[PDB]
Amino acid sequence: HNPYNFVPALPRDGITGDLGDCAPAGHSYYHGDKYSGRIAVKLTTVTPLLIPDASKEEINNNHKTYPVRIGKDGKPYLPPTSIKGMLRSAYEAVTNSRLAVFEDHDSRLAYRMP
RNA sequence: ACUGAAACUGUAGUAGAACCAAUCGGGGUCGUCAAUA
Prior knowledge:
part of a larger assembly; 1 chains; little secondary structure; two-stranded antiparallel ribbon; flat; RNA-binding; CRISPR type III-associated protein domain-containing protein
């Protein structure tokens, strides 16, 4: 198997509901009908996890070596932004949302002609 | 055909109230490349 694939992003004309496009609920108050609060999540790694510290990247012969990023206690610092992007892309898949990061795709692509 | 004198423009009053320098973003990842003869 190829190590990547694609969940199809379906067109969203006539999507009419919470999965549709909508004005956001806002931040001003907790709406009586909408849920707020804290979810506690246990994350456990199944395969090894890479958390590169680019701030400490050793470079020799233009080859970069990354240590694990660690917090003030010396345990691995898994960044919340890394979890957020994992969660967002998975969320955006299963809700068939907009593509949040779709950058620089307005030129035609090039290949060897016959 | 004799200069008036003497008298503090001072006294009281806070350049201040309000406003989050902030919103979104996994330090990530795979197919060639080159154009003649």
